[PDB]
Each structure stands twice: as structure tokens, then as C-alpha cells.
Design a protein around this ligand. Structure first.
Ligand SMILES: O=C(O)CS/C=C(\O)C(=O)O
Ligand SMILES: O=C(O)CS/C=C(\O)C(=O)O
Ligand SMILES: O=C(O)CSCC(=O)C(=O)O
Lengths: 333, 333, 333, 333
């Protein structure tokens, strides 16, 4: 049996995570669910957005599915954001963001790519200083983190049909940091004979994602860069509302939708569980259940295409009805 | 009279700059032209991409139109990029990049926005270090540069119909640097009572540029961020082949197409001079010939929709035939 | 009356401040003493080494006399050293450290100099980072801080008979930081034309302090440099038991002996109060009571020459017998 | 034979280096001298201060004896300090700086210590940046370089009667940088269990070197710290004119006097060649000629005690006459 940690988090995490739990159970796989809490609502109760227990429960399971974390408007004494934290604490060094065409209004066809972003360093070391009216931030690239992220993106590419990786970078303007990242990935790519490795300057890569996204298979890049390119690519195929995500290290992983807590629509029973369900499909895949992953994805596609749709997506099916449809389509495969 | 400096630079700059000059003359404004050199082809004949005398000439003119610079593959000792240099030397702190729909294959309709990128600091401060297997770059944000770029963008936004400015930033993960930028632009916006100032996280903005680009008017952001956003935006309206730009400081400004030298077509008389002509339009606008600028742009759109098309647009018109068509179109408005 | 804040701190702080207080009362000046609390012991009782009410009492006084603070080697969470906090909280940018020949065994004669050390920046910004096996610390020189310290030291030079200021620096290996410090002091020196200003490289300076200290009147230098040069200087004239100090800014000042809490000896009834009494004399001077200050100095010399010596000076006298001797001598001046 | 590369450099380098050669010859050792040039005079007639030809000569030799460098009072385009370059280029990571009592006026009795300073990093990485009116320099400490210098110091301690090492640090204000260094030198000490390892804060060390230098045998410290400490120490025992040094790596070593090129004195044939001779002695020791090196040391001491004294030591002897006396003293041992 697999042990899955479920963390609902904030707002509509309380609706999409139960949705995904149901779909997961409909796979027929041996699944044991543990619950834990994190995020703003948690913070408002216990002065921390990731209690120690939640770390312990995470580490006790094969994988974790997380719902939503509320973006703080004001800055709040003591309130570190939860995903940012778990990334560091659990060393989830690889951020995996697929962008795939879905049968939905205004989403380009012919897109099927995976953006693998370094999750640990670059501008995200968060080592800023302000002296008089000048502020400075470290942007840090190491050979170690670059190998780690290189090998991850390479493992992902090699299990995909087109066997292709683009290293997106800015080595021309930043040859010491960004060049180190470019070169290390190229170096590490040598134990992956089956993969075609190109490199592309990040600004041009963004342009190419808009004009010719069908050109890409897997893209590897650094922290801020990948942040932008993922979110770029999601606009191509539905926006954040349908964007799944993995956060993967060597011992455990956390999967989450990218949409926030959606504070308005929360509690209203109309949130679309797609992002959460697809994240759960990513999770099944990471666990080694490739068939179920593909079955879960196929189910979601069918309901997105023909079955009842949620108000973000045209229709006025509830989360319940949408989830019901997905469960049905899944059981029939 | 206005004195314009023409710098052809490398490759197709030798074709598109003379094309722009012809159009500039067909406006019947009082124009006097001087010529300078910059770039790789110069570097090869002089040990410098920007001769000190090119700098003299630029400063003796009202404005500069620059063709294209080649970048070689692995850097040559002594060779710095001509544009990068002129930006520092001449303190052209505002990089201005329109993305406007055109009647051309592969351009969305309904787009009309301007990205204003800080052109001086951020990651382009070029301050890297490498200690053992760890590399570190400075990312620098100062009040003063942020003030300068803020007002540049607020000036641009309020000469435009919708009078709207979005500040694109990453102040949430980077509150000292990116937060200084946000607060400074917000601060100086107070002298611009006609402009509706919004802000947006840079990843969100990337996504929104892809999904709803018609919601944006002007966007202000920092150096690397802007480099990425501008090229994304260019993908929405034809790519780099048609993208005009200006580098503007307090005393001079240098305008240039973004397409590059294009060595594989250089010399064949089939380069599209559109990006240069629109750069010359931007320049006329900078000089205060607002109405001539609008005329030049209209001339170009007329021809794009209904005149000779160059091969990159699916046609077989020479640079010559296209330029004549613009000249004629222009002389009828 | 003059309002003096008294902070004992830790260990011998408890023995030498009461001694300093008695000597201050013995001048017959009008003095109100306000007692406050700071340091290690205070942290153990209160969860902060500088209670907010302490900061208040200080700002409510004309000047503060501080005893001694332990900084345990152990690395404890929540505990920041008291003096470093107050330096930054109260903007006490000038560290003033006289070294004067005195009649004790091991005092070189002919020594009479003041080291003025920049107290807010340099290595002391405490902005360090560790990435894998590489640690980086910021060392910051600002123009603003350099003029403030240069101006402070020129003024102290000005009110001294020799009118000689040495700027000690390392601008040779550090042209940008140390060069800025050096040049800025030279720029401000222009408002003090009667002061003879020299520049000496810090290491040569260290050497000259050992060989020929009579060469120096006033020395100005940066944070870590002044730290080291002060302690070298104190060594020539009897060491830490005798060394006084002021941390002075624009609105208040805290005077403090250089020695620490001295756990090995605290409670033993035998610490040398000279350093605390001389720091009190510096405080009187700062308060404008220059005759009284010299008088307190004279009483101390008289007793150092002839009177009961404490164990650190080869005698068998207690802190109390030393104090009453100084008081007695003072009463007779 | 032993191949010794001789570099006179600038000013009195031209006088003392031949004095040193003569004294080396008189030892009777099999020696080959290979003449090379470096320094300011070398830059003025050749455009670089270390020709590539010099570097070759050095690396073709077992050891190098260098005289002195003028470091001029400006930013001469192209001119870098010769020794500063050689330390980087040859990886001469250990700066060995002995301070021993000698029979001369000014010299304090009972001093016999060695300062071993880290020679590649800390503040000497020379990564300075100036942004507006704020300047920042990296101070870098790596575990790797600290292993290398700790080990070098421990061997030196191990090879000495008293078998004592003090690690001089500022880990209290700088726990990430100076802490790393302290800790690393302590882990490496585990391999030298017969060496007694103390730690002392750097400023407290400076004080202690003035009051009780007897307590030191070997001191290890980081770059800037050792710079100041060594020059402090030289002050105890006669100053620069008598102060030798080594710059030692894993493959080669350059030895050289601490004093400058002495332009006021150059050409007058009255410079004191002690410092160059004692550096020649250090070199002998580095080459395994440990008895020879002592003989040379002892020959110098006899001449310091009895024989003709140069003007800097209150005699009227020529550089020539001092040298001849040293040679004769040597030959009779
Ligand atoms: O990582 C960040 O910059 C904030 S978290 C947001 C994402 O991961 C995303 O929406 O791509
Ligand atoms: O090492 C430096 O700081 C530049 S050269 C001066 C010395 O080596 C010294 O006098 O200790
Ligand atoms: O500044 C850069 O990194 C690129 S220079 C050409 C440019 O500005 C763009 O392609 O957006």
C-alpha cells in the first residue's frame, strides 16, 4: 500500500483536496490517507504555517498532495508561506510544471511540454541587504544544485517520447552564474545518450513558447527563470486554474495545484478540482503507478471535453458533480 | 532641422537602415544624416565594437538609429556588445519595447502595449564572482534608478489613450530589492494624477500577457524581468523580425530593431525593413514629430496588409520593393 | 542636573560601575543617576539583553555609563550582544578609544593618542552567507558614514594641542571600499585646515604604534581596523583593566570599559575600576565638564602611582580600597 | 644543485638581493642562480610587472628570493603589484612571518613566534563593487583554504619545541566566515594531537602580542588579520629592515623581505640586507637545508650584536661591509 499525506490548506483547498482523494480512491489502488495542516488558516490558529507535526507526517508518507496556500496581502510578523518553507525544509529541489493542451475554451492544441525549474537557489536564496538607498540580492548558482536539477530534467525527458531537453538560460549576460548552470547541465547530460539537448537563451525561449510551443518537450532552467516560463506556458493551455505541479526531492515529494486559495469562491462548492486531480496523477506517476496516472489524466480529459463543466470553464457543474463525472469515467477504464 | 545618426552595424543592418532613411526622408521633415559604425564587423577592423568617435557622433545628434549587432558564439577577447556598451556609456536607462498587433501572419489581433524595462541595474550590473564551485551574481535595485524608470513609464502611459501602468515585480520573494522598485514607482506615480497604476507579480503578468494581453497598456519592470517580458510580448505580434525598440536616457536616445544581423540572409536584398522603419517611427515620436511618426506607422501597416511582403512574411518582395511601397503609401496620408 | 543612566551589565560590571558612581559623586557636580538593565544576565531574566525600557531610560538621560556584557561562546538563540544593539539602535557611530601613558608597571611612557573608529558599518554590517563550503561577508563603506566619522575625528584632533590626524586604511588592496573611506576623510579634512592630516596604511600603522606611538595624536579608521588598533594601543599602556571608551553619536553616548564581564574574577571583590572611572571621565568631558573630567583623571593617576594597587597591578587591594583612594585623592584636587 | 631564482625588483631590492646571494654562496651549498625581473621598474620598461618569462624562470627553480616592489601612488593602467600577482598565479597560500628577538636597539627580548597568515582569500579576493555612494567588498572564507592554512600552521607548530598554536579569529562578530575558519582549523588539528591548540579573538591577540609576546609560538589567521598582526609583531623586534617572510605553496615558494623599495635610500649602498638574508635563510629551511639556515641566522645575529651596524641601526656601515661581516661570521661557524 501507498501512504498519501493530504493537506487541504486554505480556501478552496478544502474543496479540491477531497475531490482528488475521491478520484484517487476510484483508481482501485491500495491507498492509505493521512491528514495534515499547513497555510494561513493554520497560521491564524498556531502562529506557524507549517507545524512540526506536518513535517513529520509528510516524511512518514510516500507522497504528499497539498491544496492551496493563501497569499498574504499585508506582511505578517511570523508568517512564512508554507510551500516556500517545505521546499527548503524537505529539500524539494525540482519544481515540475507540465503544460499540456486540454479540451477547454481558449487553450492552444498541440502543446505538450514539461518545465523543470531549480527550486533551491538562484534569486531564491533570499539573501537581500539594503544599505542607504541601494538594495542588493545574492543570485546564487552552484555546480551541485545544477547537477541535481540537470539529472532530474534529463530523467524526465528520457521517459518522454520525443527524448528532447532545452536548457533555458542567460549565460551571455551572466557567464559566471548562468554559464555554470548551462555547462553543468551539458556535462551531466552525457550519461543520457538517448536525449537531444539544445540550449536556448531564456528571453528567446519565452518568445518561442508563445509562437511555437509545439517545439518543446522538456525545458530545464533556474529558479526565477522557470517561475516565469511555467506561468507563461500555463496561459497557453487554460491558465493557473488547470495547472498541476510537483515539488520533488530525493526522499519525498509534494504535489499541488498552482491556483491559490481563491478566497471569494471558497465555501461555495463550485471550485474546479482539475488542477488538484492532475497533481494527484503526477503523484501516482512519481510513485511508479504509470497506468493509473495515465488513467486519471484520461478521465479528467473526458470530463473536460464532454461531461459536466464548472463555471470557470463554461458550465455550472458543482465540484461534486465534476468530481462524480471524473470518478465515473475513471472506473470505466 | 533634426540631425540623425545612422549606424548600420552588422549584416542586414546594411539593408534595413538605408531602407529606414528613405522612409524618414519621404516624410518631408527637415532631416540631416551623419553616419557612424558599431558592432562585430567594426570590432574585426578596429579592436573595438564601439569606436570612441561613434560615441562623439551619437552625442552630436538629436537621435540615433542603429541597425543590428552580431553576437559571436564563444566570446572573443576584447569584444563587448555594442548596444550593451552604449546603454552604460550614454546612460540609456529606459529600454522601451512596443508590442502592437500588425496585419501579418502569426500576429494576434487586439494587442497594444509597451514594456518599459529598467536598462541599467538589476542583474545587468555585471558583478559576478566564482569561489570554488559556487557562483554569485549581484542583483541591484536602487531608489534613484527606480525613480528614473518609473517616471519614464508614467510619461509614456499618460501620453496614451487608456493611461494605465502595471508594475511587474517579484517583491513577494524579494522584498528588499523588488519591494524597493514597487514602492519607488508607486511613490513617483503621485505626480501623475491621470494614470491608473496597478501592480502584478511578474509570473502572473507573463501568464496574463499570454491569456489576456489586451488588458495591458504600459508595463514597467526591472532589467532581466523586462528582457523576458518584452520578448514574450513580441511573440504575440509577429516575433522579433518586426520588433522596434528605443534606449532612452535624459540627453540622447538610440533606436534599433531587435532582430539581429541575420547572416544567413545578409546581402540578398530580402530583409524586412519593418522593424527598422518602426524604430524610426519611435524616434520621430521621441523627437516630438508625433504626427509624422503615426504616418510612418500607418504606411507600414498599409503595406503589411496590402503591399509587397518579404519572404519572412510569406511573400517574395525584395527590401527594395517593400520600402518603395511604404514610401508611396506614406506620401498618400 | 545632569542625568546619567547607569547600566551595570554582567559580572564585574556589578563592581566597577558602583565604583565609577562614587567617583562621579565625589566631583560635587549635580547628578541624577537612573539605573537600567542590560546584557547576558538580563536576557536570562527577560528574554532580551536590552529591554525596551532600558532604551527609554538611556534616551531620557544626558549620557550612559555601561559596565560589561558577556557574549557567551555557546551561540544561544534570541540573544544579541547588548553593546552592538545599542550602537545601532542609538546610532553611536563614533568609537572613541584613548590610549594614555600612566604610572603602572608595563606602561610605555610618552603615549598619548586617540583612536576614532567607525562604529556602524564595514565588516560589522553582519551580512554573512554560507553556500555549501564557502562563506561570504559583506564589508561596506558608505560615503555618508565615512564623512560622519572623519568629521568626528577631525573635531577631536582640532581640540588637541598637536592638531595631527592619521587616516589608517587599506586602500591599496581595497581601492573601492577603503579608497572611499580614505578620500572622504580627506574631502572633509578641508573644513579643518589647521589639522595636519596624514595617511598611513593600517599594517604599517600597527607597526608604528608598537615602535613609535609618540608619533600619533588622533587616528581615524574603519570598524574592524579600529577594533584591532585600539586593542594594540591599550597593550602599550597597561591593558584592558585601564582602557576607557565612548560610543558617541549625534544625540546620545554610552561610555563603557573595554574589558568584559570577566567571569573568572566577578564576585571576588577585586576587579580594577580604573577603566570604568576613566570612561566616566570621558562622559564628563562629553557632558562639557572638562575641568572635572581632568580632575577625575588626576585622582586616578595619583592613586595608580602611589596608592593601593589592585591584584591586576601587582597589589593586594580590593576594588573598594582602590575606589576610596581615588575618591580621597579627588576630594583634595 | 639547488636552483634559486633571484628577483631584485625595485630600489633597494637591487642592493639587498646581491647581499643575500653572497651569503647563500658562502654556505658552500651547491647552488645555481637564475636571474629574473619583476616589479614597477620592470613594468615601466615592459608594460607588465611580471613578465611571462619571469614566471617560467621561477617554476624552473626550486625556490625564489625576491627583493622589493615599489607600489606607486595612483591607479597606473596595467600595473598590478608583483607579489600580489605571484601569490595568485603560483597558489602561494601560506604567508609565513617569523618575529624573533635580535641583539639590536629597539628589540624586545624573549620574542620567538611565527605568524602564519592565509594568503589567497578573505578580503584579498578583491571583489569590490561601488553603487552610488555605497561600496561593498566580499570577505570570503572557504573550508578548503582553511584546511590548507590550518595544516600548514600545524606542521610549523609540530616542527617547533613548544608545540603551541593560537588560532586568531573574529568568529564573535563574524560567525559564518571567521567561524568557518576557526572550526576548520580545529578539525584539522585532530591530526596533530601533540600540538596544543588555543583560540584567541584577534583584537585580544593584538593586545597580548604587545604585553606578553612570550606566550605565542605559532599563530594562524586569515588574510587581512595576519597582515596587521605580522606587522604588529615586526614592531616588537626591530621593524621592517629586519623582517623576513615566505609565501609558500604546494609546488613552489617565494621568499622576500617585508620592507619596501626605500626610494630615499636606494643607490646609496647603505641599506640593511638582514631582512633579505633571513628570508634567504627561510628559503634554505624550505629546501631542507635546515642546518645551513641556522648557520646563516646565527651569522646575522653575531654581526647584529658585535659587527658593523648599518645607519638604520645606528652605525655607519655600508651594505657591502655588513655583508662581508656576515659572510666571515658564517664561514667561521
Ligand atoms: O515561486 C514563486 O515565485 C512563487 S510560487 C508561484 C509559483 O510557483 C508559480 O505560480 O509559478
Ligand atoms: O599583503 C598586503 O596587504 C599587501 S603587501 C604588504 C604586506 O604583505 C605586509 O606588510 O604585511
Ligand atoms: O538585454 C538582453 O539581455 C537582450 S538585448 C536584446 C533585447 O533587449 C531583447 O531581446 O529583449
Amino acid at each position: 500500500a501507498y501512504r498519501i499525506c493530504l493537506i487541504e490548506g486554505d480556501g478552496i483547498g478544502h474543496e479540491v483536496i477531497p475531490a482528488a482523494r475521491r478520484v484517487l480512491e476510484a483508481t482501485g489502488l491500495p491507498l492509505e490517507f493521512v491528514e495534515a495542516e499547513a497555510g494561513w488558516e493554520t497560521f491564524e490558529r498556531r502562529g506557524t504555517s507549517v507545524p512540526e507535526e506536518t513535517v513529520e507526517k509528510i516524511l512518514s508518507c510516500h507522497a504528499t498532495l497539498f491544496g492551496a496556500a493563501t497569499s498574504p496581502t499585508r506582511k505578517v510578523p511570523g508568517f512564512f508561506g508554507a510551500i516556500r518553507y517545505l521546499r527548503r525544509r524537505l529539500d524539494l529541489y525540482a519544481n515540475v510544471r507540465p503544460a499540456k493542451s486540454r479540451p477547454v475554451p481558449g487553450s492552444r492544441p498541440g502543446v505538450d511540454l514539461v518545465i523543470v525549474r531549480e527550486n533551491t537557489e538562484g534569486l531564491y536564496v533570499e539573501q537581500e541587504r539594503r544599505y542607504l538607498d541601494v538594495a542588493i540580492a545574492d543570485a546564487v548558482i552552484s555546480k551541485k544544485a545544477s547537477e541535481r536539477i540537470g539529472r532530474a530534467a534529463l530523467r524526465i525527458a528520457e521517459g518522454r517520447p520525443r527524448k528532447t531537453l532545452h536548457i533555458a538560460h542567460k549565460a551571455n549576460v551572466l557567464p559566471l552564474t548562468q554559464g555554470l548552470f548551462l555547462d553543468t547541465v551539458k556535462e551531466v547530460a552525457k550519461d543520457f545518450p538517448l536525449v537531444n539537448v539544445q540550449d536556448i537563451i531564456v528571453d528567446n525561449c519565452a518568445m518561442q513558447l508563445v509562437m511555437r510551443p509545439e517545439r518543446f518537450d522538456v525545458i530545464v532552467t533556474t529558479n526565477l527563470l522557470g517561475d516565469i516560463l511555467s506561468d507563461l506556458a500555463a496561459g497557453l493551455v487554460g491558465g493557473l486554474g488547470l495547472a498541476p505541479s510537483g515539488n520533488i526531492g530525493d526522499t519525498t515529494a509534494v504535489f499541488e495545484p498552482v491556483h491559490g486559495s481563491a478566497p471569494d469562491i471558497a465555501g461555495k462548492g463550485i471550485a474546479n478540482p482539475t488542477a488538484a486531480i492532475l497533481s494527484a496523477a503526477m503523484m501516482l506517476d512519481y510513485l511508479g503507478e504509470k497506468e493509473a496516472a495515465k488513467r486519471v489524466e484520461k478521465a479528467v480529459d473526458l470530463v473536460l471535453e464532454r461531461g459536466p463543466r464548472t463555471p470557470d470553464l463554461g458550465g455550472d457543474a458543482t465540484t461534486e458533480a465534476f468530481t462524480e463525472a471524473v470518478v465515473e469515467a475513471l472506473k470505466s477504464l
